[PDB]
Structure 1
Amino acid sequence: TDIMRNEFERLAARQPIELLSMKRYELPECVNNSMAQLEHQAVRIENLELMSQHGCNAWKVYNENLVHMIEHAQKELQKLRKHIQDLNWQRKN
């Protein structure tokens, strides 16, 4: 129950063929392809500078968030565990 999306998706899976993305960016008409590699390499080297500036502080700050997210799930595992055993406990009598 979807639009055009479903027709090309089911056709891609049935045929067993992924749609090719041509971004000759890597190889380099080649005067353009060459000039593409420079600007993205400069953007790359600027994109690696702002990461290294913070470095591991930005990563371990997100690692702490993932531990707050995890413990909340296992608290609900217990709350379900208790009420599940509590219902069975009433049935037993």
Structure 2
Amino acid sequence: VDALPYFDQGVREAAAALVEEETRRYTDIMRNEFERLAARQPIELLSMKRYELPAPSECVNNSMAQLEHQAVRIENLELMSQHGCNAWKVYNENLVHMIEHAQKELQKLRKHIQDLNWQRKNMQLTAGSKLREMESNWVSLVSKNYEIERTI
């Protein structure tokens, strides 16, 4: 389990091969049906391509459609121009309040992420010393046991 990241400054391709060798050894209605079919087939359902073209001299209806929607259009452009750019820049201000809130959370996550790594670092340096202490003592016995036997 234990593998010191901060302390071990000195194999991935080697260990990958040894891990590889142990791997060599071992809810909606109709809506969902047409939606998944439209995405799978990559085809959007065709809309009413009629109102825009039409023709002078069935078309009596198509003509009368163009008038009422054009009058609704010209009324729909009047109430926009009345306010004008005030209604747009009022929504632009809302988008700046929405944006800054996200980047505050980017910082809060940034701080606690570096704070967790900061605690780990001390632990790595604590034990890495203790392992260094153990290995020095290990090498001392290794030669001590020899020099005892050489003299006997």
TM interval, shorter chain, is 0.7 to 0.9
For the structure 1 residues 6 and 86, does the alpha-carbon distance in structure 2 shift closer, same or farther, using more than 3 Å as the test?
Answer: same
Ranges of 4+ aligned residues in structure 1 off by more than 4 Å = none
In the alignment, the residues of structure 2 paired with residue 34 and residue 40 of structure 1 have an alpha-carbon distance, to the nearest angstrom, of 10
CA displacement 1:17-74 (0-9 Å, x = unmatched): 32222252212x1000000000000000000011011111110010000000000000
Question: Computing the radius of gyration over CA atoms, which structure comes out larger, 1 or 2?
Answer: 2
Q: CA RMSD in A?
A: 1.4
Q: For CA contacts below 8 A with separation 6 or more, give which structure has more relative contact order.
A: 2
- Matched residues, percent identical? 100
TM (norm. structure 1) is 0.87
In the alignment, the residues of structure 2 paired with residue 81 and residue 25 of structure 1 have an alpha-carbon distance, to the nearest angstrom, of 54
The match for 2:106 is 77
Matched, 1:90 2:116: no
Gaps of 5+ in 2: 1-26, 121-152
Gaps of 5+ in 1: none
Aligned residues: 90
TM (norm. structure 2) is 0.55
In the alignment, the residues of structure 1 paired with residue 33 and residue 88 of structure 2 have an alpha-carbon distance, to the nearest angstrom, of 40
